[PDB]
């Protein structure tokens, strides 16, 4: 009686806990991708500071050359110009000259004595200016190096904190990777997990959605004005600001591969083929090693860059007209909820976040909310 119930409970105890831990800590892995996004922004700032420090070292070497060679050799020269009174020169020459002065008066007026002293004074003014400029350039290089070093220290502290957080989140991600799921469970719980991930994606899309429609309307208005100018016997050329506003997110257009390549790498799966069960494949998947990026198929606004189960901190950069090739398992975040990213420009550097084993750029060609074939979407 009760023995059967106890045995059934013992056999079916931990499956739900394992699945819940897997899903929740895959979301936590996507959160770790967001933390790595902060760390990577700090690392890009540190790389900019390191380039600035290298430029400051080059400027310090140029200052070495100019001012320190001035000091050593050209101040041997300067103190020799002064030695023309101090060391083997002049000694306050006031002795009367003899008949037929071969220079020796023009000398002390402006020649190897007088113009020597005149050019010495000119070069002393030049060297005082050079020393003031050396001090100014040393101050400038020190300010650049202090900006670089303060940025490096702040970024190092932030990166250490983010590294501790990412270690904790990586333990969580292993706890996620512990478990697996079943088939009808796949259908149901995968509908739920995709609902949650797309709910985050749609929060980001509602934050950053108006841009595409506004740009499409602006492009339509520009085209209408250009057409009407011909009807009025003129030509309506939009200004630079007007052209920039109109062509920001004018739409994805026909898929022909005319946009920047999101990432270079091999492709494994094909759009419309058998990906998982009888469900049609959402799009072509770039199967390769982890770290390969992904972005929009055309210029537009980023519809999503945030933690999402399965797709990681997916950079779902919408190319316009509903086409959002998400950066699956993205480990970064550049265009957050409210910002925009175009084709090639990744709102997030893809990786192995969100539970995905490696970078699989499942670029879903979403046409009217439905999957489309991406095979002819590569022309250049």
């Amino acid at each position: 009686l009760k023995s059967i119930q106890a045995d059934i409970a013992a056999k079916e105890r931990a499956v739900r806990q394992k699945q819940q831990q897997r899903a929740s800590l895959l979301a936590q892995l996507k959160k770790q991708e967001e933390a790595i996004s902060e760390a990577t922004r700090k690392l890009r700032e540190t790389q900019n500071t390191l380039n600035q420090l290298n430029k400051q070292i080059d400027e310090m070497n140029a200052s070495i050359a100019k001012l320190e060679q001035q000091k050593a050799a050209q101040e041997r020269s300067l103190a020799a110009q002064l030695d023309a009174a101090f060391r083997q020169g002049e000694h306050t020459g006031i002795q009367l000259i003899l008949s037929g002065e071969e220079s020796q008066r023009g000398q002390r007026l402006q020649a190897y004595f007088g113009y020597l002293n005149q050019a010495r004074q000119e070069t002393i003014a030049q060297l005082k200016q050079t020393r003031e400029e050396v001090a100014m350039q040393r101050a400038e290089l020190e300010e650049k190096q202090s900006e670089q070093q303060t940025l490096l220290y702040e970024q190092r502290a932030q990166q250490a904190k983010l590294t501790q957080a990412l270690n904790e989140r990586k333990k969580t991600l292993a706890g996620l990777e512990s478990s697996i799921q079943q088939g009808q469970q796949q259908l149901s719980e995968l509908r739920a997990n995709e609902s949650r991930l797309r709910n985050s994606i749609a929060r980001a899309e509602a934050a950053a959605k108006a841009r595409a429609e506004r740009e499409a309307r602006e492009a339509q208005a520009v085209r209408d004005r250009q057409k009407e100018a011909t009807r009025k016997g003129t030509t309506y050329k939009p200004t630079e600001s007007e052209k920039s506003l109109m062509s920001r997110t004018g739409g994805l257009g026909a898929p022909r591969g005319q946009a920047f390549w999101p990432v270079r790498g091999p492709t494994l799966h094909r759009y419309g083929e058998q990906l998982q069960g009888e469900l049609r494949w959402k799009g072509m998947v770039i199967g390769a090693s982890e770290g390969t990026e992904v972005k929009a198929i055309a210029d537009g606004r980023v519809i999503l860059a945030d933690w999402l189960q399965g797709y990681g901190l997916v950079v779902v950069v919408e190319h316009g007209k509903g086409d959002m090739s998400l950066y699956g398992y993205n480990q970064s975040a550049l265009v957050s909820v409210g910002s925009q990213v175009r084709a090639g420009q990744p709102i997030a550097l893809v990786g192995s976040s969100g539970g995905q084993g490696r970078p699989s750029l499942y670029f879903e060609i979403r046409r009217q909310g439905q999957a489309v074939n991406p095979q002819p979407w590569l022309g250049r």
Binding site: A73, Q74, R76, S77, L78, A80, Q81, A84, Q88, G89, G93, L96, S99, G100, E101, S103, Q104, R105, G106, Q107, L109, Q110, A111, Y112, F113, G114, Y115, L116, Q118, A119, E122, T123
Partner: protein
């Protein structure tokens, strides 16, 4: 005209009568007279003779960095050859580079101080055009108004150093010459006066026998001109022994100091003048003394 011959014979006999008295009088006249004729070598030779230009302001405008080989003629076409200027001393660029190195200014900084910016320029010789004081002065800045030449080190030179010779020297030597050319007159006149005073007795004797005022005079005049003439001739025999001897010393210092000053001697055009002047001095002294001692014996 036997009176002239008789008077000359008497004067010659009177001179020959005392060979030691005559010789010691010619000796002092010649020595007292060679000083004007040997100190005239100095002011004729050397000084005046070797007149080597003077501290003239050949100094000129200082050209800027725009000066070049072509600009040198352009400055000449404006000031260095079109305005007042005689010669060209444009030592621009490398010209006043090695010369500046070998002068009192030591080199070696040029290899260290990039390139020497020797302020360009070009010493000029203001010809008549600008030669004149005012011709320069005002138009000196007008000369500056030519091509480029950022500055204009044009100067003056000479200064007071050209006064401690036109002043101190210009009076002392003239004073010394005046002293000597008074001493020669004084010594000749004194010698002749004493010679007449020695033989005043014959003047008295032949005056109180009749005679005339002019007969008594001739043997004394001809014996006073012959004393100046013979004492000046020996000064020309001297004053060439000394000058030729001094030629050795001047020749030695020629190479040691520089330009070789050339010494020379007295010319005929001045030798004849000296002989004539001494003869006239002796003659007039004899006339004065005899006329003074001829109104004494007239009671």
């Amino acid at each position: 005209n036997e009176q002239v011959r008789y008077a000359f014979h008497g004067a010659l006999q009177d001179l020959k009568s005392k060979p030691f008295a005559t010789f010691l009088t010619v000796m002092v006249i010649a020595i007292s007279l060679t000083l004007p004729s040997v100190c005239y070598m100095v002011y004729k030779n050397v000084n005046q003779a070797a007149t080597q230009y003077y501290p003239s302001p050949q100094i000129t405008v200082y050209l800027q960095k725009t000066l070049d080989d072509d600009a040198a003629a352009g400055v000449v076409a404006q000031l260095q050859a079109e305005q007042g200027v005689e010669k060209v001393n444009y030592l621009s660029r490398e010209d006043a580079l090695g010369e500046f190195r070998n002068w009192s200014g030591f080199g070696g900084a040029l290899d260290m101080l990039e390139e020497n910016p020797l302020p360009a320029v070009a010493v000029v010789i203001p010809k008549l055009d600008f030669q004149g004081t005012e011709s320069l002065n005002t138009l000196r800045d007008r000369i500056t108004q030519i091509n480029g030449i950022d500055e204009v080190r044009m100067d003056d030179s000479w200064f007071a150093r050209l006064a401690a010779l036109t002043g101190l020297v210009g009076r002392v030597s003239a004073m010394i010459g005046v002293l000597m050319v008074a001493a020669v007159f004084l010594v000749i006149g004194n010698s002749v006066r004493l010679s007449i005073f020695a033989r005043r007795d014959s003047i008295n004797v032949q005056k109180l026998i009749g005679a005339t005022d002019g007969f008594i005079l001739r043997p004394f005049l001809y014996g006073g001109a012959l004393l100046g003439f013979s004492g000046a001739l020996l000064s020309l025999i001297l004053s060439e022994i000394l000058v030729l001897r001094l030629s050795s010393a001047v020749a030695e210092v020629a190479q040691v100091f520089g330009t070789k000053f050339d010494i020379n001697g007295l010319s005929f055009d001045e030798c004849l003048l000296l002989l004539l002047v001494c003869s006239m001095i002796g003659w007039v002294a004899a006339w004065l003394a005899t006329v003074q001692h001829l109104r004494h014996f007239t009671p």
